Amino acid sequence: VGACVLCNSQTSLRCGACIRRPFLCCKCCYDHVISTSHKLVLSVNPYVCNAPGCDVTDVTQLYLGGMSYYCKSHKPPISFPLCANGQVFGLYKNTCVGSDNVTDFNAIATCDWTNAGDYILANTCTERLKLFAAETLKATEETFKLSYGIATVREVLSDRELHLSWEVGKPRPPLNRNYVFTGYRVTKNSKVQIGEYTFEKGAVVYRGTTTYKLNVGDYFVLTSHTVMPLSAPTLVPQEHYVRITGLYPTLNISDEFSSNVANYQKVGMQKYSTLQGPPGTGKSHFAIGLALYYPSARIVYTACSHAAVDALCEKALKYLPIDKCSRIIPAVECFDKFKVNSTLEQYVFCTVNALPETTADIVVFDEISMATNYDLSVVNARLRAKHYVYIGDPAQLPAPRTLLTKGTLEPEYFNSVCRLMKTIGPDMFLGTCRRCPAEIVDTVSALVYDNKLKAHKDKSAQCFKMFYKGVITHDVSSAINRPQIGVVREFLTRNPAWRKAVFISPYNSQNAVASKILGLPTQTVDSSQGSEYDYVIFTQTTETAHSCNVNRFNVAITRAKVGILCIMSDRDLYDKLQFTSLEIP
Amino acid sequence: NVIPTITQMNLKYAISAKNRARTVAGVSICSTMTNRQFHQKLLKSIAATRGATVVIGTSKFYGGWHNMLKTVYSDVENPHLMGWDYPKCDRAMPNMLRIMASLVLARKHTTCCSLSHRFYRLANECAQVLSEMVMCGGSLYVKPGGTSSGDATTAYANSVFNICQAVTANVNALLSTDGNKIADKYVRNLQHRLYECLYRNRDVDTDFVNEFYAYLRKHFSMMILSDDAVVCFNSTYASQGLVASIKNFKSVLYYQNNVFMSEAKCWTETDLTKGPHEFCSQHTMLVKQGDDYVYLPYPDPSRILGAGCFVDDIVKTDGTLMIERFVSLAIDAYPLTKHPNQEYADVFHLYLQYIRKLHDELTGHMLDMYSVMLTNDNTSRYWEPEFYEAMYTPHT
């Protein structure tokens, strides 16, 4: 028993081959079986022929008799077909409205999540269909993770280097930090976890969360978890007020916090607020600023990853009372300076998949660009708050979509919050960028920020760009441009002060080669978000859509605080780059 | 051959009036098969006979209770009613009497089995239902004796043991009487020949066995069901010490059962227009129906109300899913309408009204929500007294 996903009509008929088993009203279920390949009908019992040794599972061939369901070959004389008169017999048959068009639901429930069109339908459909699309996309990702083979430690060549034998007949997952494995210790009759691990080409260089002395026998698989049903929408209904509702602003605020006071009042004027924060603008400065601005308000800080919420705790520890703050951790080393698992504390810090069921005066979403409609819906089902604050940036990276192969996911399709602010504009905006010099700011303001991003620093004259195709080589799951690295090596010899820089690239293999050749610390652009360095060296290494991602490139070259060197393969972004150009040595 | 087996010790979960954790015996399958291939045919005849002393298999509906009570009143001179119950029948019964019951049950194989076959069947029975090895909570223990409730022939063996105890009580009552004071020549000669046949003869005398059986049937009429018994006896002979009284039962139990019985288990009735005080936990009341006075059994109303209020599974807590549960209870509680006490009839009337309310509630969840009507007309008789009155009328 449930509610029809297209009608909200009470129903018990679930599409049997449809992975999330959604409740479909008799008319809706009839259309879903007659217009797709879904032929299994699940009700309280299945509408499967209960005759011995029968495989008939299509409802349009089934007849109800006596007290059961039979195929035409096995049916008794007296019956009426389960599929007749434009509806399927079942619970709540009379109370049924139906839908004029079933195309969107069919497209979402039949898609393999490999096309950008699937995501555009998922993020542009109705709220209930949005929820179903989120459920089926996460379930499809979870099952696809199981499609990868088992990697077992055959030989431990040294520390930080292993030798892995892979399962036959199954694909090997790409070796990058986006694929987090888990070890398993061989026992008498079962297996036990030995931690979470990441892998990279060497042999294979492994980086586990907890150091161990693993030997021959340990194996790694990508951990999967049960996909929970959704009930709450991705966004609560918008409400606009004439006064600040449920909050009391402080009468004494510091000049560190005065710039956002007007934005702190707008947070009180609406049910939910969308906030865009450029690199180095003080997104943590703002969100923790709402805490002191409303001292009596109970605020829950939530984020998708452990890293961001800990960074919020780090900035909270700098400005907020340690006794009133709490860090919720499920039963990964994270923030451990607040009291652990204290739901009823005034200031609660936790991630999406571990938030408890509670209420608060304000709930703070950080890093909303990596958030999906699933994470949006889950927390709203967990937290009921008077005010809702979404902080993130469309011009920054999204959560990776492994199944996506065709097309590029525009920011206005990452999630519901990203869709509004990319269309109706952000509710507030901080126009001051404090980290990068003006030249990076002016380049990234025109590219993605509508020229709305202002710089706080002046021009640094250490932002340097070079156009160099080089030679691109490909390994199993990444790309390498050794001549691009060689140019950087020649640059370092003539500019020894640039050896304090951090090497960044959109490919892990490029970082692996550059680390041994240059010796600089290496970071992928996806992992570099939320960090900062004085100098960085960026190599595009390709001209692919992965490297030319205007959200990624915004993230890539903006991790430098003083100076930057960009070896570019794409002419379009090179021309957009307002840096001082060089000639190839 | 001999096949020792293991019988598991399960723990029951049911409604009761005293806090004892009653347990039952999960006997194995081989013993079940081999004991069936004997006592299926032995006992299906017992369960299908009407008018005998053992009333196993006789229903109380459609006038069965009246027929049984009138049969047990079969021509007694100065009738009184008496009843008793053994304190611990299963856990204190000696092995000798169980062996005796098994032997009298196997007496029916005079043709199909030779002596060796009978002995080995008896050995198998003694090995797996008398002194078997019981598994109580994951450990094996040796059973001292008694009887295992959960085998094929528990009730019939209990009936045999009950009849044996009654006959022993009668014999002890007759042989212990003075004898010089007995004023009836026939009874004095009966006593003399009873002593001769007990302690002066090594072989069975069928003539005196028939004579004494006729005497017992004439003056001491029994009705036996497992360990329950109701007896109609000549009061004058019992007062004179010529048939077994209740103290004769107590002495026999004391010296042949290692058990002392008290008045909490036994009762007497001097007016037989009221029926037995208790038999199978049913009270008997003489009512009038259709120009005839009949006997109807009614239960303790507390039992019916407790069965209504407390349930085994949580699904039974919702009335609409289990309505036949209340129909059966109303069938069992109908005879309370005739009781002089008003609350007893109020129980049955309350049950009928609750059944009506349950039917209306079931109809409402349907019509309102998923628009369908299933009231029918065969349901309307479930809250009328005719359907239940027909259960106690002798026409089937």
Place this chain on the structure above:
Amino acid sequence: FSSLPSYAAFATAQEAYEQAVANGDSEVVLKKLKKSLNVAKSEFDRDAAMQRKLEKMADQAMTQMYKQARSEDKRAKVTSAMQTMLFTMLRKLDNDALNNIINNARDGCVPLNIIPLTTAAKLMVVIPDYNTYKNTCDGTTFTYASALWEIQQVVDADSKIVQLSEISMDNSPNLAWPLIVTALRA
């Protein structure tokens, strides 16, 4: 059984036979109007029989299934229904000794062991703050479970002892607050 086409056939036959009987036409001709008439009930009182059995299959199929949607749903929500029923009956009982501890436990005061019935045994209670300490304990007495219990010991959450006169409001924060209190029934 009115919305069927062979109903229209039966109606035509009935009209024809009514005309034949009201007219008194012939002997064999009206036999023809009763030949194709009594058969019209052989494809009516039949096709309106299987379908009429089908309908009662329906109403009662829709029934063996609402009560399973119901049976399998009811045994999946026991843990909240039982608790709500418990507290509804407990509130309906309206006993002072039960209500006192109900309110004490809803705000601050939970005992650490079964409340003893004898006049000797020990009782250990948890006091979370001073506000409850005012309501319950007054001096060397302790009113709880509608009974009087003399305190023999009060120790803070850090397992350090505390005396029965320091406790006040000026050492408000100079006391750890999850005080535990030991008492004996009077």
Place this chain on the structure above:
Amino acid sequence: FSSLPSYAAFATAQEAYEQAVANGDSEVVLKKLKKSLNVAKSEFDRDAAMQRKLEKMADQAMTQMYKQARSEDKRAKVTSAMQTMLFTMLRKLDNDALNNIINNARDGCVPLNIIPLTTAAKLMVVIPDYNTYKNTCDGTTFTYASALWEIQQVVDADSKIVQLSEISMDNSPNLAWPLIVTALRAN
């Protein structure tokens, strides 16, 4: 029932019937016409009532032998289970301390109740109270069945470990007290 031969005869008789009825020759001619179809409706009767009642028995036969096959597979499963259970419980027999005591029997028959008494290598005592613990299982080593046993493990009713130092007189009321003490036969 359409691929039956009598359908063709019924159809051709009916076709001639409708053709001559539209023609409408006479009763003297249509008598044979309306008798041939009246016997063709009787033929298709027979053979169609000789067929649709065999589809029931064939279906019943298929179901019955389905059921018998299922039973015959379950029998093999239970046979394998019983045999493997016997063979795995035989391997704990301690086939050296049992052979010696068996060989000393005059006939080879020994009572069952003395087999675990003189051969088993583990003893598990169950203790209801401390006073019974004092007289039976006192200390780290005790004696029973004319043998000496040494304690290795003690658990309470909750199957949690208890050290031998916790079993005192005054500390007894703080223990679940069907204590299970397991020990090995020492030599």
Place this chain on the structure above:
RNA sequence: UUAAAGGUUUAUACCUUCCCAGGUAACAAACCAACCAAC
């Protein structure tokens, strides 16, 4: 009011018997499932 009986097949009508179909009701026997009571 129209000699008699007998003869044949065919058409019509009635009655009777058998057989083959279709529906209604009853009775019983089996099987399956849920529930209640007693020792």
